Amino acid sequence: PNVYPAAPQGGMAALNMSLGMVTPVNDLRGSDSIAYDKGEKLLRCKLAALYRLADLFGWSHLIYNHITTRVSSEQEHFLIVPFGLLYSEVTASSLVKINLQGDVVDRGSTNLGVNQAGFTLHSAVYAARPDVKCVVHIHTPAGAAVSAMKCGLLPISPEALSLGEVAYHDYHGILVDEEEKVLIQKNLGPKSKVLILRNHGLVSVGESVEEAFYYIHNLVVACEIQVRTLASAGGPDNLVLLDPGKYKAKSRPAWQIGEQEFEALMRMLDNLGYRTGYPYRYPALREKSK
Amino acid sequence: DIAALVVDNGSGMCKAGFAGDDAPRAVFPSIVGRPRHQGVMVGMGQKDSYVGDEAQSKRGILTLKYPIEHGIVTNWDDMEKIWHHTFYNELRVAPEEHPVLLTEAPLNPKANREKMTQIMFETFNTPAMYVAIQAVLSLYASGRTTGIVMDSGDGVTHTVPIYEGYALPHAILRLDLAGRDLTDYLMKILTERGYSFTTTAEREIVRDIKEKLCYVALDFEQEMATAASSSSLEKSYELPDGQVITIGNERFRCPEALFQPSFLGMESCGIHETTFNSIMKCDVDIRKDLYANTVLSGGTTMYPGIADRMQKEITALAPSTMKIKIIAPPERKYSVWIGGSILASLSTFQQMWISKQEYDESGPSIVHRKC
Amino acid sequence: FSMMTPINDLHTADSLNLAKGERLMRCKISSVYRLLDLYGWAQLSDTYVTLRVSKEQDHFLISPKGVSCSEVTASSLIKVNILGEVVEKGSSCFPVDTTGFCLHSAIYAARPDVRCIIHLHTPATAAVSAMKWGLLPVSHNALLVGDMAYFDFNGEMEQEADRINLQKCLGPTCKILVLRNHGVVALGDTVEEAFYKVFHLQAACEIQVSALSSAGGVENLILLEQEKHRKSRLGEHEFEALMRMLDNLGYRTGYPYRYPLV
Amino acid sequence: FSMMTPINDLHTADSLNLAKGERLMRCKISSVYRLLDLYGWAQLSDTYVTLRVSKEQDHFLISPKGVSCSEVTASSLIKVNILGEVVEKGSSCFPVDTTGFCLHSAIYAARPDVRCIIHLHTPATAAVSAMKWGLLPVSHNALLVGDMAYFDFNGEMEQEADRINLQKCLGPTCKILVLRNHGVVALGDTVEEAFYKVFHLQAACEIQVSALSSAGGVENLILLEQEKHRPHEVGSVQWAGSTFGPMQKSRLGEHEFEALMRMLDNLGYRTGYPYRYPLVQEKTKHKSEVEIPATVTQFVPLYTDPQEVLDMRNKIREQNRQDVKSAGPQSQLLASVI
Ligand SMILES: Nc1ncnc2c1ncn2[C@@H]1O[C@H](COP(=O)(O)OP(=O)(O)O)[C@@H](O)[C@H]1O
User: Fold this and answer.
1) D188 strand-pairing partners
2) Given A88, A227, A235, which is nearest C214 (Cβ)?
3) Which residues are modified to Tele-methylhistidine (chain B)?
4) Cα–chain-centroid distance for residue A55?
């Protein structure tokens, strides 16, 4: 079966599994990896797998949003999806390595170009913080609902309180270059790994891909909690609130942060047959046996 | 009220009756007799040839020959004589007023159907006639549309499976092991007792003996041991001349050639193995129903104990999880005609009749177009 | 298990007559219908998408009645005139009914520049159209939609007064028409424009209904104003990308790409 | 594309020390994890479902950390003591973390009646728990939920004061514990009853969320009260089964669990759950008058030469040609007299 049968409301996910069957993401082979770096080869795997995983959960809105990662092997480089190709068809070799200013370092496997306007915000965030290596910008249907609301995010769920401090950026939407960039830069100071745009969507930064995915998934879950909680009562009927610092104090060779859920989802993606090629801390579900 | 006619033909028996009736009107053997002795008696009744029930009365002065053997006609003129006797002497109805329904074996040469259709339109001016499969009509007489049927006549034995009213042509199995060959074998094994039968009338006498005093053994070796060690399995037949013979051991020996053809030396397998192979040739999904519905047809399957032995032999070859049951209607001799009496009575069957006028532009091959 | 249905099968028939680039553009409509089935927006037969063939002699393409959106092919479309009478029926053995085409015919009689019309009955747009506030500028996609006019709907366009009311309600320049208690209608110069506008409109409607159910008050939401907002193809890249997956998956679409891609 | 995973690999692995009843308990408690995965209420393990093995020795079945609900098998689950130390480890190579078990232990020290615990983190249940009001009796499912207790949860259950406060406020006879801003906890004597209550809470939570979203205010919902009538839900599950005797008597969640578990067995999930009510498909029976009942319920030696026979007849025919005179054999009695 080239195409899986479609649910009444889940056809796009079924096509995502079908395209996972048809086109593997580990496009790099032994002969096809000539004149290519090792760390970049490792990072393209994670980035392409993240693009493939983003469309499955529904956090993909055509080609308007982008997910960027930073490789600090050379002086100055970044990776991004080419413009004009959706999330469900992204492979490791099809990703484009570009400069901070948007200059295309190498064309890559694909022929299509790169959008500078989408990369402007990512460039602003990357130039603002040197420690940030991954930026994920998504637009879920509940996230723009909570973002356009006056009060903003509320400490209603432990997922919301796991985010800690959150930054807010007002949507003026004039997008004239450098001064928009500097408003982005000093509207998000030190730390504050989660940024909320008032109308465009949600964005999370992270030192690694796994940590950024964990933060954005916590933000999405907390948003889904917050919408249903505040829909019933929106004011003097006091929904139960927790102190952030005080509940955080009571919340309180080891496994790294964010790798557990990411590796479990890689176990999904390999069980289906996407052939992700993600490096596994524990490649076997069960023990050694024979 | 014009009603169709159902005429069932088999080697040794011809039946005929009006459609929609419970009983056929005429049943008589398909025999043709010609005088053999010097006829010297001026002024009294002599004829060139005797046919039907009248010929069987005068077996002493006649040579009796069958026009059909193994479901294939040998002399068409004798077949015309039998058909004329059936249409005129037995039913006393005009053949050109009522439609007639005819039956035949499933696997047969090309020329038989064409010659039969040509004779039936040209000689008798039949306005409409149709050809049907015998075993399919027997299954319709049982009243189930699915199952595998075994029809064993005096000409040939055949098992066909029918699923949802369709008989699969690839799964049809035909074995040339009939009751006339059993009669010949019974004559050969009665030779060793001291009684000798050679003429054709003596063959009919041996056939009557077989019909009256034969049965099927459940266990062959145990019945041989019982018959050798005791005289309980002995019956006496009383010949038409007053002589008395003792059938003795041979009663279960003649029908056992149905299950083991090595007695006759035939290469083919037994009848139960033939039914099992015919079931094997079908698809798996329907096999359950083929093991669930099996009916027996034909006069050869009237031997006592045929159903128990058939069920045991099929269960031996069947898987252990399968359920085997055998259906044996008491009127299994005349099932086929009964099915014909069903098939002509339906309101959708009047369009199934072959048109007389359409045959004029089509020709003798028209049945292959319509049947 | 029947396999997926090919979208372009007009080569198999080779009996219907063709005019100009119809061999291409028929397929476009089929793609749009398939796209609806990929989004769960509509899976039951209705007059959703109609297309004008040429600027002259007023020929239009509509979907046959009783055919679900998954089974629409290129050769199954129905060609009618402005009056709705069948001119060239498609290769679909179904009875024909054109009572739902009349509103689209009125819109076509209003604007000669309007070519493609998209109508949807999804819960978000129906809730927004039933709402007296209409579409609110509380999302980025709502600003991307543009400006729309609101029209009270009785349900039938056979009356002349309702027709002239529709022309004086639509105005000279408008691309989105909101029918009260019935939904939204997207107008486009091409199929790409109509698809892009209706997709952004539904995204904006979902955001608006979610935020308005969450807050419980209109003044609880922040309000954006139009002052900040106020080759050369608005919406061909997105539809071409969806076309690229459709061709890579196995759908035998006849769309020619603008660039040689890989 | 192979999402089937065998849920009972105890016989295949043969590398574990099982207790008197582990063979049934492990499959029974992995089945509910699979059902939680299929309903989509939870996909990433936060130690949702815990089981108690025996009353004489307090051992508890918990899921290993870092294992998704799709990957849960019966042999992969581990058993721990009430303190939290590992007694016997499953056949899963993962670091052991029993941090989330302690709250479940806070249930086990209080009530000896409860045996299985399910914790829910679904958006609807968390919306109802975070709501100022509780589960409002506005639906039939909420009436079938029954009485319930609310408690404030603050992330730790390790000091003695929080544990004794929870055990005091939980009460002697309560089945549902609502943790504020965290979700719901269902207590069960049996796994089927607790899964039944989990399903009814999820349905009632979704109903309440939709209802309070639809109408601004509680007074518009014209809610009924459970207390005024005080029914005993008598007369439910009237049965007219043919194989067994017709009785009203059934447990709270057996009949719903049997069908789900037979669903799981049909595809190929090799579960070891014993069905209390056996099921047989048989072909239907006929009572048409057409149907007829069935009648019953060396001679030649193996090594020889034809050329020998030909040479023998040639030897005889040669004597015929020669015509040599020779008398016949004579008796020995006549040989004596000569
Ligand atoms: N009562 C009976 N018991 C045993 N065998 C019988 C009996 N009647 C007929 N037969 C056998 O069946 C044969 C007749 O079969 P029949 O049904 O006439 O075949 P068809 O009609 O197909 O020619 C006879 O040769 C005879 O040996």
Assistant:
1) D116
2) A227
3) 70
4) 11
B334 Cα: distance to centroid of ligand 1 (angstroms): 10
Q: Is the CB of B153 under 6 A from ligand 1?
A: yes
CA of B182 to the centre of ligand 1 (A): 11
> At which residue do the structure tokens 């020390």 appear?
D17
Residue C8 and residue D256: Cα distance in Å, rounded?
48
On whether the CB atoms of residues B275 and B150 are closer than 8 A, the answer is yes
Name which of D71, D130, D212 is nearest A239 (Cβ-Cβ).
D130
Single out the residue of D5, D131, D117 nearest to residue D61, CA to CA.
Answer: D117
Judge if the beta carbon of residue B12 lies within 6 A of ligand 1: yes
Resolution in A: 3.5
Helix pair C160-170, C102-110: axis angle to 10 deg: 50
The CATH code that applies to domain B179-258 is 3.90.640.10
Contact A62 C210 (CB under 8 A): no
Residue D338 burial (CB < 10 Å; 0-12/13-18/19+)?
Answer: exposed
Structure tokens at B280: 């094997």
Q: Are strands C116-120 and C86-88 parallel, antiparallel or unpaired?
A: unpaired
Between the CA of B186 and the centroid of ligand 1 the distance, in Å, is 15
Q: Which two tokens stand for residue C152?
A: 């009270």
Q: Report whether residue B11 contacts ligand 1, using a CB cutoff of 6 Å.
A: yes
The letter for the amino acid at D267 is: L
A198: phi > 0 → left, psi -120 to 50 → alpha, else beta; which?
Answer: alpha
Q: How does DSSP classify residue B147?
A: E
Is D291 in Cβ contact with B144 (below 8 Å)? yes
Calpha distance D196→D260 (Å, rounded): 12
- Residue in this structure with the two tokens 């799981």, named with its chain if needed: D264
Residue D186 and residue D107: Cα distance in Å, rounded? 11
Burial of B207 (0-12, 13-18, 19+ CB in 10 A): buried
- Cβ distance A52 to A278 under 8 Å? no
Cβ D45 vs Cβ D67: under 8 Å = yes
Instruction: Give chain B positions within 8 Å (CB) of D289.
Output: none
Q: Both tokens of residue B208? A: 């009557």
For residue B155 and ligand 1, the question of a CB distance below 6 A is answered with yes
> Among the residues of B219-355, which ranges form H helices?
220-229, 271-280, 284-292, 306-317, 335-343
Angle at C254 between CA C248 and CA C257, to 5 degrees: 70
B152 ligand 1 Cβ < 6 A: no
From the alpha carbon of B68, which atom of ligand 1 is closest?
A: 23
Contacts 24+ apart (CB under 8 A), B280-289: B281/B168, B281/B170, B281/B171, B281/B173, B282/B161, B282/B163, B282/B168, B282/B171, B286/B146, B286/B161, B286/B163, B288/B322, B289/B146, B289/B147, B289/B163
* Whether residue B71 has its Cβ less than 6 Å from ligand 1: no
CB contact under 8 A, D296 and B144: no
What does the angle CA A129 – CA A134 – CA A136 come to, to the nearest 5 degrees? 110
Chains C and B touch (3+ CB pairs under 8 A): no
Task: Name residue, tokens 């099932």.
Answer: B335
Residue C232 distance to chain A (closest CA, Å): 15
Single-letter amino acid, residue A203 = V
C91: which DSSP letter?
A: S
Cα–Cα distance measured from residue C251 to residue C33, given in angstroms and rounded to the nearest whole number: 13
CA dist., res. C77 & res. C75, Å (int): 6
Q: What is the DSSP letter of D70?
A: G
Q: Give the whole-angstrom CA distance, residue D106 versus residue B197.
A: 103
Residue among B82, B154, B158, B212 whose CB has most ligand 1 atoms within 8 A, to mutate: B154
**Phi (first) and psi of residue B26, to 5 degrees:** -125, 130
Q: Give the whole-angstrom CA distance, residue A129 versus residue A131.
A: 6
Instruction: List, comma-separated, the residues after which chain D is broken, a break being a C to N distance over 2.5 A; otherwise answer none.
Output: 297
Assess contact for B4 and B19: CB atoms under 8 A: yes
